[PDB]
Amino acid sequence: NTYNPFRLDAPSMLLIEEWNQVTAGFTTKNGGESEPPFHSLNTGLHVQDHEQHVINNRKKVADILKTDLHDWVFADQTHEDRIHKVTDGDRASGAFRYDTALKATDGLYTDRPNLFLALCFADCVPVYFYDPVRSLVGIAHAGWKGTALGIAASMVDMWIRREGSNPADIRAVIGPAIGSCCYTVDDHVIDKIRNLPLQQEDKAFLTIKEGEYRLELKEVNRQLLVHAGIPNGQIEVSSLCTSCERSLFFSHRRDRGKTGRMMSFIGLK
């Protein structure tokens, strides 16, 4: 299926065209230095890959975007719902060492120029946020936990309440993540999903058999953005499934737990 709203600058980059001034995108599996099981453009420092290879994969992505890795900010992602407003002082945090990545953080946004925000992915849902009026860019990492927590709606509530955004001005993109085609969950997950402040929670999951459910994590997040006040017309959901697209993405589910991570990135220049 189409890459839309992304454009493929092969091999390594998928770029959100309409936003580019914002630079936003998502990396692919290809064009890196990492050995199996991280072949080849692994960007995670937390998956026991060779550290120098990950920094070089990041150094290559930073150079394609004609930026410096010193102006990048990374998160210690704990699959909760903490959103950090990145400022100049946060520069280079987590970019070369995981020790300085933003602790227990899964949402990032900023209004400062030349400051690139970065989240790691290999099946979970990447969300992008852009307010062209307030000149805010943001990204959030939503697995099933972050989805049940509504980390995507908190980004919108944070822009509305702390930053003075009009929710009608906010644009959002949902990137490559695991589709319902390849994702089944137990009651423990579904009970937490169906407890979201959405009334149409069950539109995103079905029952295969008792205790096994198919779940579309992109759709719950899209529902949470519309609930939060973003007009549905201003949300674009990538159809790409990280499990299905074997030549493009790492997938935690397909690869049986030991694999690389792509990254989403956004920044203003």
In whole angstroms, give the CA distance from residue 76 to residue 44: 10
Residue 166 and residue 239 in contact, taking contact as beta carbons nearer than 8 Å: no
Residue 188 binding Cl ion, by CB under 5 A:
yes
120 is in an annotated binding site: no
Residue 241 binding Zn ion, by CB under 5 A:
yes
Scan for tokens 């423990």, then name that residue. 188
Binder of Zn ion out of 181, 186, 206, 211 (CB under 5 A):
181
Longest dimension (CA), the chain: 52
Looking at residue 35, the DSSP 8-state letter turns out to be P
34 binds, among K ion, Zn ion, Cl ion, none (CB under 5 to 8 A by kind): none
179 binds, among K ion, Cl ion, Zn ion, none (CB under 5 to 8 A by kind): Zn ion
Nearer to Zn ion, 184 or 234 (CB): 184
In whole angstroms, give the CA distance from residue 123 to residue 243: 7
Taking phi over 0 as left and psi of -120 to 50 as alpha, with beta for the rest, 265 belongs to beta
241 binds, among Zn ion, K ion, Cl ion, none (CB under 5 to 8 A by kind): Zn ion
Secondary structure class of 26 (helix, strand, coil): strand
Residue 182 binding Zn ion, by CB under 5 A:
yes
Residue least distant from Zn ion (Cβ):
241
> Looking only at residues 206 through 225 of this chain, which bind K ion when binding is defined by CB under 5 A?
206
206 binds, among K ion, Cl ion, Zn ion, none (CB under 5 to 8 A by kind): K ion
Residue 8 binding Zn ion, by CB under 5 A:
no
- Both tokens of 96, joined, read 């070369």
Binder of K ion out of 191, 202, 211, 212 (CB under 5 A):
202
Helices (H), the chain: 51-64, 144-149, 151-161, 187-193, 217-228
Residue 176 binding Zn ion, by CB under 5 A:
no
Residue 246 binding Zn ion, by CB under 5 A:
no
Extract the annotated binding site. 181-182, 241, 244
